[PDB]
Amino acid sequence: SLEAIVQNASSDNQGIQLSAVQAARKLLSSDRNPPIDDLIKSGILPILVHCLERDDNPSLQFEAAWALTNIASGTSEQTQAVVQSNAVPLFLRLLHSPHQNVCEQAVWALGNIIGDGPQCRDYVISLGVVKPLLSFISPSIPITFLRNVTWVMVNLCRHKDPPPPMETIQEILPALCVLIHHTDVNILVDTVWALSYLTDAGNEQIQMVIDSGIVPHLVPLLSHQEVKVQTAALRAVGNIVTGTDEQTQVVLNCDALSHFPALLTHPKEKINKEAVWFLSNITAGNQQQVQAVIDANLVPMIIHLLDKGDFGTQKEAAWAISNLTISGRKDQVAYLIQQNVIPPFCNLLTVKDAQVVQVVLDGLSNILKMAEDEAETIGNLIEECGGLEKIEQLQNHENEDIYKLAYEIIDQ
Amino acid sequence: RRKRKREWDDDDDPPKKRRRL
């Protein structure tokens, strides 16, 4: 029973103590559901935290660290109980243990603590976790351990309210520059996921990522053999090209567009949807970037997805087309018309998602407005495919911005 | 003209907490 175990772990007899802490560890590491609340309420936490000081019994330290690791894996209240019992400074101590498995378990427990949220992360950071953590990254570290280190790095990078301090980001980026050349898939996946978390934090963090020099190593992972790697990288570069035109061009200069035919035609619709969302952010760029997308022969693939894709992919392709009309030359828009964009574009006028409808009406209006003299020909094509009837029906929509734009388009 | 940030789930994220077995 729990009473016996709690009483026994604070013992003078080294074998009963080890046995009792081992029993507690095993209680937390077996079934799909462990008794975490009963162990928290039993009072065992101070015994386990005390066990972390026992440099004379690395087996006891490992077992106690593992128990605490698994307690910290539960809800925020359970993780905070581990934190409130003063475990964090003791785990930071065990990062300098000569015993590898003890060190790895200390890393793992700290990973679970860091993962709970931004304030917990920032506490662990303020106590100095990052340098001893990144010091493990070396050619000789065993791979199971290196993987656990990289998972902790992901948890240092992923919370955004606030993001990790700039100085912490500055320490992690050189390590990611090292790890992105690893051949192990799980390490590569985590490294790239970390980059995707840094690149979603804002334009200054995007710039730091660019300045590390890693983007030319990141872009080619879009064609990696493992799909988990491809989609992590697709997220990371997609976030970079949400930045300025200058920032977007860094990604394009890495030949990013050469990787997209295999993403636009991928069997998995989620990959199609991500890739079209990337391209919509390229076509929102300057005229030279628009031309880069045209010249990569991606517009026909986009229009096909506009016509026959899943609704999420259709919505992003609608944005990519409309954004193309906003910041595009007359001749680039003419290329769109020649590729028969108009019918599949107008077919989205009837969907129940008003945001997509607004985007489409805006793009149709801009298309007609930019072709100063050819406006009659373009109006006739819109009529031919039923677009006029669709606009007339959109005059009765609930949404004022929609019905206003439909009236304005028909009048103008 | 402007860029957008994604409006979907991204349910493939790596685990925040991991319980060792």
Residues A257-273: b if buried by 16+ CB within 10 A, e if exposed: bebbeebbebeeebbbb
- Is B11 within 8 Å of chain A by CB? no
Checking A290-298 for CB contacts under 8 A at 24+ apart, the result is A290/A324, A290/A327, A290/A328, A290/A329, A290/A332, A291/A332, A292/A252, A292/A257, A293/A257, A293/A324, A294/A332, A294/A335, A296/A257, A296/A258, A296/A260, A297/A261, A298/A257, A298/A260, A298/A261, A298/A264
Q: Which residues contact A331 (CB under 8 A, 6 or more apart)?
A: none
Phi, psi of A330, deg, nearest 5: -50, -45
Which residue in A has a C-alpha nearest to residue B8's C-alpha? A312
- Is A283 within 8 Å of chain B by CB? no
Q: Does A312 sit within 8 Å of B20, measured CB to CB?
A: no
Contacts of A189 in chain B (CB under 8 A): 14
Phi, psi of A62, deg, nearest 5: -60, -50
- Is B18 within 8 Å of chain A by CB? yes
Resolution (A): 3.0
- Is B4 within 8 Å of chain A by CB? yes
Task: Answer positive or negative: Cα dihedral of A57, A59, A63, A65.
Answer: positive
Query: What value does the CA radius of gyration of chain B take, rounded to a whole number of Å?
Result: 15
Which residue in A has a C-alpha nearest to residue B19's C-alpha? A70
Nearest to B1 by CA among A338, A166, A283, A201: A283
Task: Assign residue A135 a region (left: φ > 0; alpha: ψ between -120 and 50; beta: otherwise).
Answer: alpha
Q: Does B3 sit within 8 Å of A241, measured CB to CB?
A: yes
The pair of structure tokens assigned to A412 is: 């103008």
Question: How is chain A split into domains, by residue range?
Answer: 2-411
Which class would CATH give A2-411?
mainly alpha
What DSSP assignment string belongs to A74-100?
S-HHHHHHHHHTTHHHHHHHHTT-S-H
Which residue in B has a C-alpha nearest to residue A327's C-alpha? B1
Which residue in B has a C-alpha nearest to residue A316's C-alpha? B6
Q: Does B20 sit within 8 Å of A29, measured CB to CB?
A: yes
CA distance A202 to A198: 8
In one letter, which amino acid is A182? Answer: H
